[PDB]
């Protein structure tokens, strides 16, 4: 055999160091470990999308809870805060719900007032002065 692989403990080790926390023979036997480690790596790569999606779902759940604490609904809160030029994202709104609940109540009241303004604007169609919180700051 003119030349044969001397450095083969280390390739096996490269795969096996990622399988030490498995169950059964996957943590020891290279042939089974490789399959499971490949699958684990594909899962880890694909879980970044799911991480982001699930974070937004959690934020939306927590904001829904928080706004129902004040009688609002999540659509009302989000939409009517957007209409007040308040570009707060879902993440920050959920931290405000948990940690700064007076600021959240103020934001909920701001959303409610904008929503009532919208209802008044749509009810009395015509030329009537705009709602105070309906006014938009223009940029140029």
């Amino acid at each position: 055999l003119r030349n044969r692989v001397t450095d083969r403990y280390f390739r096996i080790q490269e795969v096996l160091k990622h399988a030490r926390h498995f169950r059964g023979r996957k943590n020891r036997c290279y042939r089974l470990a490789v399959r499971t480690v490949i699958r684990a790596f594909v899962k880890c790569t694909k879980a970044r999308y799911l991480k982001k999606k699930n974070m937004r779902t959690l934020w939306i759940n927590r904001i829904t809870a928080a706004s129902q604490e004040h009688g609002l609904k999540y659509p009302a809160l989000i939409g009517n805060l957007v209409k007040c030029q308040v570009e707060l994202n879902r993440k920050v709104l959920a931290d405000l719900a948990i940690y700064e609940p007076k600021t959240f109540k103020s934001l909920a009241a701001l959303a409610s007032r904008r929503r009532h303004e919208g209802f008044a604007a749509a009810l009395g169609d015509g030329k009537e002065p705009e709602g105070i919180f309906s006014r938009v700051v223009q940029y140029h």
Binding site: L58, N61, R62, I63, T64, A65, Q68, E69, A97, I98
Partner: protein, 59 residues
Amino acid sequence: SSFSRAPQQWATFARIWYLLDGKMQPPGKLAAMASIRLQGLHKPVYHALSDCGDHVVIM
């Protein structure tokens, strides 16, 4: 605020006993509220692994 760590934690994650009268009420509408509060989906602290459900008593 200005609580100690242990009481703050205890206050945040304590479970509240809710009462719901079911007289003349549709069972599904009762069930919606009961399921929401039993899971703890009414709390901004909600996480699926936090074990933050509440007690619901339906009479």
